[PDB]
Amino acid sequence: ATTLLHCGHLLDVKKGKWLEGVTVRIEGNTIRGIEKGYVAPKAGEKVIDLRSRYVLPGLMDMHVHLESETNPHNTLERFILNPADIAYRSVGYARKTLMAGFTTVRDLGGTGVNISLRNAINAGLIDGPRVFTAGKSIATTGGHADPTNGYRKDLMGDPGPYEGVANGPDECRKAVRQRYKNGADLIKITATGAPQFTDEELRAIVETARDYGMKVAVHAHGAEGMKRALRAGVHSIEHGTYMDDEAIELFKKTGAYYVPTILAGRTVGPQIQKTFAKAYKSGVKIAFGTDSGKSVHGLNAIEFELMVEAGMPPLEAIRSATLNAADLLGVNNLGSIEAGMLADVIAVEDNPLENISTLRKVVFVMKDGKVYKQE
C-alpha cells in the first residue's frame, strides 16, 4: 500500500537540516523515498497533509519500564499484583508512550510480562511502540535487581540464575542464556547499589551476551561499578550519577553510550544534570533515556528540555533520541527518514530546533506503515 506524506518541513537528522515542502513516499512499512514538492497521487494513494507540520523520525527512548508506573503502593503491590494485573496496566502505559511520539523503546526491567507485551504488540494485538526488552534484570544475590529483596525470611527464598540472580561466572552464563531462552532482546544488569559485580562476572556476562547477539546495558550510579562495567565491554551505562574523570576516559575509549536519565531522579539530586553536562562537554556518546515509569509514561519528552537546559544543542538531543538510539540498539533501519528505513514518523507544530519543548505535544504519529495519531 502507498502513503505519501506532504511535509512542509522534514528533518534530516544525519545532515541536521530541514527540508522544505517535500513528499515522503512509503510503501507498506518502509520509506521508499523523499521527493521535492507535494506529489499528486498518480494512482489512488493515501496522502497525509503535514504541510503545516515539522516532521521527525519516530523518537526512541532507551530507558523505560512499561510494566510499572509509580504509585503510592508499589512496594505492597509487588506482593499483591499478579501477571495479568501488570499486563492490563502495561496496555495503557504502552499506548501513552506510542502516542507521545516514541515509536521505539528499550525496556530495561520487568518480571517477564514485558516480553509478552512486545510479542503482543508485534502480533497486532495491542497498540504500542516497538519494544526491545531486557526481560528480567540480572543481579547478584541481594543486588538491586534481586527479586526477593526485602521479603520476610519465609517469603525470601533463594533466587538463582533462573530468577536472574547469579554469583560467579558460570551462573552468570546460565542467567544470560536464561534471558535469551525467555525471549529477551538484550541484557540489563545492576552493577552498583558498592560494586555488585566482580570483573570476572562482568566478563562472563559480556562474552555470553555477545555470543547470543545481545547487548549489555548497565544500571550503575557508583563510580567503581561503572568503571568495571566499562572495562568489561558493556554497551551502555544508565544514570551513572557519580562519574570519575576516569569513567569519562573509559567511555571515550570503549565507545559505550551514556544514557543520562535526568528526568527520573529529578522526582527523587541535581547532581545528575551536572554529571550530564560534564559528560556531554567531554564528548561522551549520549543516547536518550528517561527511565519512564518512575516518571509518568507519555511525559518522556520533558527530558528533551532538561537535556537542552544542561547545554546540549536541540539537534544533538534529537539525534540522541534517533540516530544514537538506533545505533545503541544495533538496528540499521530506524532513526532517519531516508530510503530503506522503517516508516516511523512523528510530526509537531513548531520548530523543534528553535524550541525543543514543542516535542511534548506530538500531533502526528505513524509506526510501521500505520497511522496511529493525526490530531
Residue 82 CB, nearest approach to a second copy (Å): 5
Residue 80 CB, nearest approach to a second copy (Å): 6
CB 22 within 8 A of CB 7: yes
Residue 86 CB, nearest approach to Zn ion (Å): 16
Residue 151 CB, nearest approach to a second copy (Å): 7
Q: Does 339 bind a second copy (CB under 8 A)?
A: no
CB 257 within 8 A of CB 328: yes
Residue 359 CB, nearest approach to a second copy (Å): 38
Residue 155 CB, nearest approach to a second copy (Å): 6
Choosing among Zn ion, a second copy, none, which partner's interface includes residue 79 (Cβ < 5 to 8 Å by kind)?
Answer: a second copy
- Residues whose CB falls within 8 Å of the CB of residue 210, separated by 6 or more in sequence, listed in order: none
Can you tell me which of 155, 194, 245, 270 binds a second copy, judged by CB under 8 A?
155
Residue 76 CB, nearest approach to a second copy (Å): 4
- In angstroms, rounded to a whole number, what is the distance separating the alpha carbons of residues 215 and 213? 7
CB 60 within 8 A of CB 347: no
- Show the site string, 68-107: x = touches a second copy by CB under 8 A, - = not: -----x-xx-xxxxx-------------------------
Q: Which stretch binds Zn ion (CB under 5 A): 25-33, 134-142, 188-196, 291-299?
A: 291-299
Chain breaks of the chain after residues with C–N above 2.5 Å? 193, 268
Can you tell me which of 21, 37, 150, 255 binds a second copy, judged by CB under 8 A?
150
Residues pairing with 132 in the sheet: 106
Can you tell me which of 40, 153, 268, 269 binds a second copy, judged by CB under 8 A?
153
CB 202 within 8 A of CB 188: no
DSSP annotation of 58 reads P
Q: Which stretch binds a second copy (CB under 8 A): 153-161, 202-210, 264-272, 338-346?
A: 153-161
Grid cell of 284 as nine digits: 561522551
Q: Which stretch binds Zn ion (CB under 5 A): 52-60, 134-142, 205-213, 283-291?
A: 283-291
Grid cell of 210 as nine digits: 555477545
Residue 74 CB, nearest approach to a second copy (Å): 10
Choosing among a second copy, Zn ion, none, which partner's interface includes residue 151 (Cβ < 5 to 8 Å by kind)?
Answer: a second copy
- What's the full length of the chain, in residues? 375
- In angstroms, rounded to a whole number, what is the distance separating the alpha carbons of residues 39 and 24? 9
Q: What residue type is assigned to position 213 of the chain?
A: G
Q: Which is nearer to a second copy, 4 or 86 (CB)?
A: 86
Q: Which is nearer to a second copy, 1 or 156 (CB)?
A: 156
CB 109 within 8 A of CB 65: yes
- Show the site string, 293-332: x = touches Zn ion by CB under 5 A, - = not: ----------------------------------------
Of 127, 87, 134, 139, residue with least CA distance to 107:
134
Question: Which residues ranging from 162 to 181 are in contact with a second copy (CB under 8 A)?
Answer: none
Q: Which is nearer to a second copy, 110 or 289 (CB)?
A: 110
Give the sign of the dihedral formed by CA 84, CA 137, CA 274, CA 356: negative
Report the largest interatomic distance among the alpha carbons of the chain, rounded to a whole angstrom: 71
Q: What does 310-361 look like in DSSP terms, one character per residue?
A: TT--HHHHHHHHTHHHHHHHT-SSSSS-STTSB--EEEESS-TTT-GGGGGS
Choosing among a second copy, Zn ion, none, which partner's interface includes residue 42 (Cβ < 5 to 8 Å by kind)?
Answer: none
- In angstroms, rounded to a whole number, what is the distance separating the alpha carbons of residues 300 and 146? 27
Q: Which is nearer to a second copy, 111 or 254 (CB)?
A: 111
User: What angle do the packed helices 113-122 and 83-99 form, to 10 degrees?
Assistant: 50
Residue 150 CB, nearest approach to a second copy (Å): 6
- Angle at 224 (CA atoms; ends 219, 230), nearest 5 degrees: 60
The footprint of Zn ion (CB under 5 A) covers 291
